[PDB]
Design a protein around this ligand. Structure first.
Ligand SMILES: CC(=O)SCCNC(=O)CCNC(=O)[C@H](O)C(C)(C)COP(=O)(O)OP(=O)(O)OC[C@H]1O[C@@H](n2cnc3c(N)ncnc32)[C@H](O)[C@@H]1OP(=O)(O)O
Ligand SMILES: CC(=O)SCCNC(=O)CCNC(=O)[C@H](O)C(C)(C)COP(=O)(O)OP(=O)(O)OC[C@H]1O[C@@H](n2cnc3c(N)ncnc32)[C@H](O)[C@@H]1OP(=O)(O)O
Lengths: 148, 150
């Protein structure tokens, strides 16, 4: 599956998917600010990105970063998906689903068979719709003294 | 907390249980250890790849040198780690060793400044992790798998 794909063209702009890991940490910070996520040191955001097995992006080209998902992984059995995000201006258009499909497909192409995530209650059904299953066989996602 | 650690010294003949986060596991011993606890044979090439790309590989060894325990974690090196493949040789279970292994793993991840330490727990070991300070579904967060076949 190619690194870059055009997911959509509309008249007014195209929406570009990429798995090359092309994220500017200021862009990602500004996007994270829109959904009100608290800021974290740019250098730590940068470190988290280059130590992610998969960094996937949505861009708006007329490049504007409008979405992103990333995954840690051991490159053999497991990947865990983090920081899934779509610009609120671009939500409700199917782009978040389209991002996650290409993410899942890229991981399966790389022979990662155990694809996991920790879903906020608000977005559980979004992932179920994509085929994720909570607590299969009673397995529990657990956190060491979380600060949530 | 150092790289390598005598957790315990005992007699029956003198045995030491040694902790290490160096990550120098012999993949063939790890393969037999995986087999001993009843996990299916995985290809050597994929197990080794999983070791090399694990941010943390922690072992327990018996020196009288035998691998008797292992735990590993993936990480993004900054914010998140997920712990996988915690196992203790059945002949060494029920001795506090799994607890001691996990405590050293948690401390190592904390020393590396990882805030979010996570894992997915089989329902029959959920209480084992609760006893170490893990919490299931905080704020209703759910761990999810894509079309799992367990
Ligand atoms: C990273 C994690 O592991 S936790 C998840 C992180 N998410 C966040 O908290 C960030 C904030 N939210 C967002 O960025 C966005 O709302 C997203 C990523 C959650 C969703 O992306 P969007 O672009 O809004 O969703 P998109 O339009 O693609 O939605 C597609 C489908 O999901 C459904 N859907 C969308 N949002 C939700 C939701 N919150 N709950 C349930 N279903 C949903 C839609 O009905 C649609 O269904 P369809 O296939 O039947 O048409
Ligand atoms: C791998 C993952 O990511 S999830 C883990 C799934 N692993 C497995 O199912 C494989 C098989 N299990 C094992 O290898 C071992 O049983 C382990 C790792 C689960 C535990 O190791 P052990 O060495 O048996 O445990 P240890 O003796 O250290 O026990 C620690 C404490 O937890 C308790 N405990 C041990 N096992 C369990 C259990 N299954 N459920 C609840 N409590 C337990 C013990 O009673 C002990 O309590 P105490 O300190 O109050 O006396």
């Amino acid at each position: 599956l190619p690194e870059e794909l055009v997911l959509l063209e509309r008249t007014l702009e195209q929406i570009i998917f990429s798995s090359a890991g092309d994220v500017n940490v200021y862009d990602l910070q500004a996007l994270c600010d829109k959904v009100g996520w608290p800021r974290r040191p740019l250098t730590k955001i940068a470190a988290s990105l280059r130590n992610s097995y998969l960094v996937a992006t949505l861009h708006s080209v007329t490049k504007q970063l409008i979405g992103m998902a990333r995954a840690t992984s051991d490159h053999a059995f497991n990947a865990t998906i983090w920081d899934v995000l779509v610009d609120p201006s671009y939500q409700g258009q199917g782009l978040g689903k389209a991002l996650m499909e290409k993410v899942i497909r890229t991981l399966l192409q790389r022979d990662i068979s155990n694809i996991t995530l920790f879903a906020d209650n608000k977005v559980v059904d979004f992932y179920k719709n994509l085929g994720f299953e909570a607590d299969p066989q009673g397995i529990k996602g657990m956190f060491w003294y979380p600060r949530f």
